[PDB]
């Protein structure tokens, strides 16, 4: 049982994704690739010896009757387009996170997907499919520390490029915790409120470190420091203290040395180390699911415009200097 | 080697009691004194110690023979116990917090000033627990940078049903309080309670709560209070500063693999944990007090510091709203 | 590039390992397969949806033009012979731990493989693509803990069954330490000593726990506890002393719990997800090279001859209760 | 208040003069002794202790004040010393070894048995760690089932040119030779030292050591010794049990996060390791005896099977076989 892929958008995560899809992803062909910079599809196809005919104008790769699978790795700017004509031409979708930035288009992807009358959407929030945090996620589920009481996230990055802004340690870093969190809490958000601690005398281009409070629905209170300037590397904490209990995420095993009186393991420097293994485990079990003739089971259309309006919420808090609240409609039942 | 006299042989005074005359050089107990008839002879017999009883504190204080005054005694005599020693013009030890209020700690500051000699240490012991003086050396030393963040955790495992929503902040939350301003060498600004969704454990008090503290120069600190979390008694203090993050240790414990788990324990009871700090805080008064000097832990200020603090914290509790810590310059004579 | 595989062998671990290659390893395709048992290829075959020749003498295999690589998965009395016959066809092999139990039988495929005059075959010894391991093997390389000298290991597992006797703990169980720490350290083993500690009165069918102490050629001293009736689950641990500091194998990471006064986490019980990882890491390394048009890089057939002497000695120990000498030939240098 | 004597006042006799004096309960320290002039009243002075310096030790056991002889003196001095004292009745604290040569134990153990009484402690002072204590308990409660093998290792920085090959044995593993015996309550049948490829950094000794013993029951003990691992002072101990494993806790640190790295601290100097076993082993002695009770902690029994134990490993060392561990019966005297 094998499914025909095209992929629109082959920039820094597209070719990875494109290499996946052929060598390490079963259920899966590549046939098909876009991109709207002239050389830059086929120079990737040619990176990794990948047969797949080449369209400038997504459409046609779209239109075209071998592509049975969209995976959507452009610009963020093209997303809602790209979605939207692929479910009109009937055809599934992965996503790449975030599914758009706003959540008015967020919403046409939804009202594409609901007129072919079945869920066809992935989004690629893979730190669901991060083994630790399926084990946090059982550990939840299972009742053993009891109600979600209180959350500690931390998303910690050594430094950012000058291009990196302010709204940025929301829409590119902590849109991972909101919607890791929601799925591991299975709640929605009600407030939002983003203090600004002691700014880092090494860094100039943005505000940083942030901290952020979120309110659940039920009233889960979700304390997330980020700092993507922090200088020693790259590091993802997060705590669930239950009525019972806490659970603790755990982080990335290293052979640990016992030299001139300390006693250390190493940190991760380079962020696309930490979810790597997801990416695959994500891809697998959406092209598993497809050609079992199942429904994706990832995160969904819905679970990106959650997160669409969450981070948007964030960016006022950060704007206004208030807790600023979450607006959302009603989960409809399609996505349930 | 001083001649102490101890104000109020209760739960923790009976404990200083047993260890200033044992554990602690420097120091002999002269006198003890209780209002409630009994308990201060009851202690002297308990561990064989021979002091002079006094019904009354004025007498231990007038007493010749007492040099040092501790203060063990309920909150509500702290202020007036302190005073008395200070224009006696003998040294005080006294137990966190100072006083019941701001004001009554303004009351010790301008009989300590009276003296123009500081001469009055309180009892917050965590200063001296060994983990702390490490975490603050490790900050001082500018190994992390200058600290921006920090996330802490008191946690226990129940409380009796006297136990209310105020004291998460006067008895609980007055700990970090204190030992947050002393690892960042700062004041605060602000403060702010959160109270997330309510332990369906917990009917006698608001539990577990939130709380948001800024110092002067932004520093922003998040303390989790869960003072019901079943587990254990544990705390937690990670700063994060510009370059690196410091994490206070906790109790070391041996380890065991058994039946697929990995483990170490948790402390239960809240007293073991800076047991040792209470033997340190007083060897290091005395110390200083019997080579001349005057003391140097936390000083009358820092606990009309705490005081205020613990104060906006409460009356956030009360109202929802961020509250604003409001203080006047620090005198001289306590820099 | 893709290369063409025929494994011999259908039973736990050749299943396990057609389904890899099949769907996980990219630059393979599986022609072909062979097991004695009347209808259990097929069975894994059709279990897995996969279509491949199916011979019932492994011969037919071999000599099946379309398969370039014989995977050798069988039980370990065949090893040499099909081994010999795939060297003797010009093709490639990949050959499960241990390479053969006797000497004169890895011997035989050493001749065999040097008949052809190039290097041809890799050893399933999967514990040298462990990232913890290469990451052990970083630092002993890089010279942080200097010059080796000491070396603690433990391999425990949960329980064995009766069918598990005594020298097993070599055979099956210690082979993984024989040839890891030699990986590790660059060393051959001078000297063997199996003791015998306490019986565990939990253990009625085996001598159990054992306590290894090997000589390196160099003096360096190794000692591993092999306790395979622990009860606690699959534990191996691993410490370097060096000169001037100590290295130590990390372990799995788990998520930790807080609660009833015990901070914890899970130790696996499992043996078979500990290493999971590394049979596809070894595999595509495998592939990749011979794609490449390269000779394999992984263990070869001097490592299993290795191996298997080494093993002989720590049997005899068993035995004798004396210390035994390991007698070794020099390393031909085709196989540098 | 009991009233002790200490004979030898060096390195520990200093430090353990400063102890009774200061830290120590229900003891006084009454007279000192050392045979280098002036030494004993240096150590007086340093720590402004009323004391009678003796340069003879029979004078300073003579003393109708001196009830407990606390024995800090050279290793060749003990069993004399010993001797002397349970000849004029007087209990003894005897710091590690107690003699070297077994013949020597023998003589203390003849001499104690002529009082009838129990009356001499060992300063083997890992027994009162509370990390020894704990993983002690984990073992005793049998949470991981009997024991079957030991791995512990004793590593230490770097040593002077004097400290020669059979001082591993004699000065370092003695204190495991003590602490796995009292850990399984077991004694040995046999001891093997190997000799892994010599440290490069190493002129003056033999090392590292990795020594297997086996216990009379067959539980196999493997102890690293690594006497200039150069990275500091490191004691690991782990028990397997038929189904668990217990481990031995370290000194707790501050952990850094920091360029890259997560690190914790590793102790450098080896005083720092037991420093509070000291205080607690004479606080347990003193306490005991105080109540009229006999000595708890190591026996002059134990020092006898240490010593004897060691014996074997030096023969070991240099003979390079197994040696066997020839023991008689324990007299009923120390059960
Ligand atoms: N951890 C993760 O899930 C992960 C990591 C990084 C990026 N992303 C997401 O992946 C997406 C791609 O990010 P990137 O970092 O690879 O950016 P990129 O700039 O390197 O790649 C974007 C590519 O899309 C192409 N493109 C834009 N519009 C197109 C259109 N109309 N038709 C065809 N191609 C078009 C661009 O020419 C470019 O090659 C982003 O949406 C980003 O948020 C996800
Ligand atoms: N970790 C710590 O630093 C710590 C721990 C426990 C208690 N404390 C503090 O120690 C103080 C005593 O607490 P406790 O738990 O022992 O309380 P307690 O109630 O057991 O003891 C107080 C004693 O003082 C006596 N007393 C009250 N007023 C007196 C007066 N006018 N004159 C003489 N005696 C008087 C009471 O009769 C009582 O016996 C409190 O301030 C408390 O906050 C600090
Ligand atoms: N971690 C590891 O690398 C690891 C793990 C398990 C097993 N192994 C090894 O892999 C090999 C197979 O082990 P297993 O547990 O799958 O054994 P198994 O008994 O489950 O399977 C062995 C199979 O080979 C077949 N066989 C025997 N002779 C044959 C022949 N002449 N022609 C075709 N097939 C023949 C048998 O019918 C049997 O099905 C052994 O060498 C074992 O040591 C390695
Ligand atoms: N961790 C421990 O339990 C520990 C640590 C250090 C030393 N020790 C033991 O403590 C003892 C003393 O050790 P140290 O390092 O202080 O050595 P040291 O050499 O500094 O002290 C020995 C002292 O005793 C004196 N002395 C020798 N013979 C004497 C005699 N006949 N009469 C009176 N005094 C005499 C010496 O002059 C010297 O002052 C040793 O037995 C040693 O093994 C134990
Ligand atoms: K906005």
Redesign the interface.
């Known amino acids: ?1 094998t499914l025909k892929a095209g992929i629109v958008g082959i920039g820094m995560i597209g070719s990875d994704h494109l290499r996946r899809l ?3 992803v ?1 259920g899966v062909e590549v046939v098909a690739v876009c991109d709207i910079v002239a050389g830059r599809a086929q120079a990737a196809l040619d990176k990794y ?1 990948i047969e797949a005919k080449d369209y400038n104008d997504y459409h046609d790769l779209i239109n075209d009757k071998d592509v049975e699978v969209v995976i959507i790795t452009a610009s963020n700017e093209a997303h809602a387009d790209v979605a939207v004509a692929a479910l009109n031409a009937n055809k599934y979708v992965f996503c790449e996170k975030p599914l758009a930035v706003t959540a008015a288009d967020c919403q046409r992807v939804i009202e594409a997907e609901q007129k072919n009358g079945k869920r066809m959407v992935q989004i690629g929030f893979m730190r669901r499919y991060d083994k ?1 945090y399926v ?2 996620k059982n ?1 939840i589920d299972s009742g ?2 009891g ?1 979600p ?2 959350v ?1 996230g931390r998303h910690y990055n050594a430094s950012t490029v000058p291009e990196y802004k302010t709204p940025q340690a929301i829409y590119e870093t902590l849109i991972h915790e909101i919607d890791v969190m929601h799925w591991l809490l299975n709640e929605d958000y009600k407030t939002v409120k983003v ?8 860094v100039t281009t943005l505000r940083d ?1 942030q ?1 952020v ?1 979120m309110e659940t629905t ?4 979700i ?1 997330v ?1 980020v ?1 993507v300037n ?4 790259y ?1 993802i904490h997060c705590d669930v ?1 239950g ?27 380079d962020w696309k180390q930490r979810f790597i293994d997801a990416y695959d485990i994500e891809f697998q079990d959406f092209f598993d699911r497809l050609n079992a003739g199942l429904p994706p089971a990832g995160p969904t259309s819905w679970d990106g415009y959650l997160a669409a309006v969450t981070a948007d919420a964030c960016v006022k808090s950060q704007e206004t200097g208030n807790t600023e609240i979450v607006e959302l409609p009603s989960k409809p039942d399609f996505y349930k």
């Open positions: 049982m052929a060598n390490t079963s010896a630790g084990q946090l550990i053993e520390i109600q009481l209180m500690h203090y600004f601690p002691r700014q880092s005398s090494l470190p901290l409070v039920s009233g889960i209170n304390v420091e700092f922090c200088q020693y590397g590091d203290t009525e019972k209990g806490m659970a603790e995420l755990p982080t990335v095993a290293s052979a640990a040395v016992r030299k001139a009186a300390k006693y250390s393991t190493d940190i991760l420097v």
